[PDB]
Ligand binder design. Structure first.
Ligand SMILES: Cc1c(C(=O)C2=C(O)CCCC2=O)ccc2c1c(=O)n(C1CCCC1)c(=O)n2C
Ligand SMILES: Cc1c(C(=O)C2=C(O)CCCC2=O)ccc2c1c(=O)n(C1CCCC1)c(=O)n2C
Ligand SMILES: [Co+2]
Ligand SMILES: [Co+2]
Lengths: 381, 381
């Protein structure tokens, strides 16, 4: 059931912005580890005396890495005279974010028809304003409201390449890496209390609950009208035997924030081959693979979707598989992206639900919690 | 002339410690870019609730990357009960350093015979104390005094693998990268006033001035008894036509600090081939190469040390060449290592002065300032 209750017209995920202490080193690590090309910049070389911002792209996926310069470089500026390319940026906010949370996502940006209207309707329906709408070079409008913790939901609308004041990256500096990643599938927040978090966000967006089909969490998924913007939210379940990874997150992050980004691949096998080749030479590590009993149970569950060879290739790469009513999900999780046990990445591919592929095809893999546990216990046997 | 006036027994450079906001991403970038292996760690997985510290090694070169965790993880600890592996670490100091200076060197560590004695003699002769001597697991002693800006000189002495509380890195996580870098040759500070900086450091170390043989700087080099610990210092020269790069550093760094680290290679040609292959895929960029007139002038200057083929290979890789009374220097400089135009790396190889090779063989390349300018002007012609 999809009531299509969006309070304003939402298109797709636009970008994800990380707040960093040094954007250069994070961006270069991410570029090599995920196979994303350097595509635009806004920094001292482009006249930005306020913040260094580097944009990485893979297909439609846009990752932005931003860090502050010394405030002394821009001490004479005022907001009307700023050289910042992101007018919502604030030195104090950024340093406070990073010192509190460490490396993580500051903004989940979605493209909308009219960012000024989206902001107004949002705050009229309970959204806490973060940065008012600002028109950039009469071409692009940006606005921000609070989403959860210190994460903002950023609205971007275009009248008619990233943002004004960003420059395309020199082709010699721009190596065309590509491991198959194509777009952001979903972005997930961890909160202490799920109910109030959902009521707030669904309240100002009109996003609806996306239907699902002991592991330390309860969760729900908010979705836009065509279910292409997907925002799951987790809360911890306390008092278990094994401590909730949601609770660990909240402790090490100093509260609510973004837990994982799920990146859709056009060929998860190639993506995982390429990423795993680089794990020990500057790229990303992956969670420990399931025991072979997990793959020795996959035939009974998805043998009508994947061949035995394609199942064996899942075993080689540690890929997980889940299935809902309409489709199948291949997924795998990285280890945390930085020093703290907080944000990580999920790589996914969805099979089925053709009409274009409909959003959320195959679900989000919550069945893989019990299947992983089951396979682990029976592998011990 | 070498008076051998060291006030205590100094051995060699031991390590360089960077203070970071996220040690993981910086360390992984540096590992891939410079061909350094992950060799030890101290972090949550080793029981350190205070700071994440990752050690990279190439030959004798040791780079340490440290970042703070949330103070909340260790709020119940006191110094007698700390889980930090580096007892001089302080959350507030580290966050203040990084917010002020961005990514950079906090500690230049040298190995000494007796770190307690080195500290005492140093402060008795004018050194400003930073962290008092602390004995670690009855095995290693660490002490720190101020060097310049917020950079400390760290003394380390061993009674008899990095430091207690650090664990060797898992062989699967430890890929044996190596591009030929073997040791730290020198570490250079930028200061507003050279005279007082030299008087201070030479005052408490007994280091002597190392003899040399319009570019925006004056400099001098302090050296230990066998001239294997080398600490150059630069000051800006104001009122020029082209603004001093030393002054730019001081502005963007918010004052004095470490300008460059010079890393000796056993084969600078292989090192530069390997590093340049990775510049656009997560590694380090290099300064723009000299015009071919520079190499079309090299035969007249070093044709008795390098063959025409080895000179052509310098041209391919952008290597600079200089010569003093006793030896020859091959050198090249990276672009800044992070967001700000502050710290960079120099790769060097020294030819000559065999007795072992004596320290500083070939000098530091200050002649390459005029040779670069000359070649540039005559290339225009
Ligand atoms: C995060 C996640 C998802 C997921 O993506 C998801 C949403 O997208 C939306 C709803 C909630 C929800 O869980 C699915 C399966 C998972 C994990 C996951 O984190 N772990 C962690 C153990 C320690 C680190 C990995 C697992 O073992 N399994 C099997
Ligand atoms: C830093 C350096 C050295 C050097 O290492 C040195 C000391 O070790 C000790 C004494 C002072 C001293 O200069 C030698 C030659 C150099 C440079 C250098 O920074 N540049 C910069 C232009 C813009 C970025 C590169 C150059 O062009 N040349 C030729
Ligand atoms: Co997910
Ligand atoms: Co040098």
């Amino acid at each position: 059931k999809n009531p299509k209750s969006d309070k304003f017209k939402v298109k797709r995920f636009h970008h994800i912005e990380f707040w960093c202490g040094d954007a250069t080193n994070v961006a270069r690590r991410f570029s090599w580890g995920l196979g994303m090309r350097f595509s635009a910049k806004s920094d001292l070389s482009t006249g930005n005396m306020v913040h260094a911002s580097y944009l990485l792209t893979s297909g439609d996926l846009r990752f932005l890495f931003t860090a502050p310069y010394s405030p002394s470089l821009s001490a004479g500026e005022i907001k009307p005279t700023t050289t910042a390319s992101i007018p919502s940026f604030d030195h104090g906010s950024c340093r406070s974010f990073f010192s509190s949370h460490g490396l993580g996502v500051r903004a989940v940006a979605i493209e909308v028809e009219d960012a000024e209207s989206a902001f107004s309707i949002s705050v009229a329906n309970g959204a806490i304003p973060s940065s008012p709408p600002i028109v950039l070079n009469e071409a692009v409008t940006i606005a921000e409201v609070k989403l959860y913790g210190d994460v903002v939901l950023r609205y971007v609308s275009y009248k008619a390449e990233f943002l004004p004041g960003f420059e395309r990256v020199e082709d010699a500096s721009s190596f065309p890496l590509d491991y198959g990643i194509r777009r952001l599938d979903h972005a997930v927040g961890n909160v202490p209390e799920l109910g109030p978090a959902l009521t707030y966000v669904a309240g100002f967006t009109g996003f609806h609950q996306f239907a699902e089909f002991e592991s330390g969490l309860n969760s729900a998924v908010l979705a836009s009208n065509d279910e292409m913007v997907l925002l799951p939210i987790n809360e911890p379940v306390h008092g278990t035997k094994r401590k909730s990874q949601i609770q660990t997150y909240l402790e090490h992050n100093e509260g609510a924030g973004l837990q994982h980004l799920a990146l859709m691949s056009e060929d998860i096998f190639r993506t995982l081959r390429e990423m795993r080749k680089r794990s020990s030479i500057g790229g990303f590590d992956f969670m420990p693979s399931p025991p072979p009993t997990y793959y020795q149970n996959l035939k009974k569950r998805v043998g009508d979707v994947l061949s035995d060879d394609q199942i064996k290739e899942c075993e080689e790469l540690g890929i997980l598989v889940d299935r809902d009513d309409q489709g199948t999900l291949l997924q795998i999780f990285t280890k945390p992206l930085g020093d703290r046990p907080t944000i990580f990445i999920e790589i996914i591919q969805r099979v089925g639900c053709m009409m274009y592929q409909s959003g959320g095809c195959g679900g989000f893999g919550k069945g893989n919690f019990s299947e992983l546990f089951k396979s682990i216990e029976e592998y011990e046997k």
